[PDB]
């Protein structure tokens, strides 16, 4: 009843209460990643993946 | 946070393939497909080699 966030294993805020209604609601990082190009050799091709 | 995980090339499911293959070279063909291609011998007469 008086808990306002939850945190992950290593320090993260994982979960928060909605200080209006009683809501508990995961948060997820925003989706990241390399950008990585497939590529046949120049010497024969410029179409990429 | 910031940090990655990236897959490896080969899942568990081809990684047990290769394992399969590895064995049932080393069942039916003894070390010869480690020489050339695997030539299928009794497995009492492997073992009898062996
Ligand atoms: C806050 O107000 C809303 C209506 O806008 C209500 O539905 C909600 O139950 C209230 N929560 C409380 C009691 O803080």
Known sequence: ?49 | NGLTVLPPLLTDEMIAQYTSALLAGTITSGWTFGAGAALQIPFAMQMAYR
């Open chain 1, 1 to 49: 009843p008086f808990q306002q966030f939850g945190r992950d294993i290593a320090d993260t805020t994982d979960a928060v209460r909605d200080p209006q209604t009683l809501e508990i609601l995961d948060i997820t990082p925003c989706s990241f990643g390399g950008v990585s190009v497939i590529t046949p050799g120049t010497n024969t091709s410029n179409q990429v993946a």
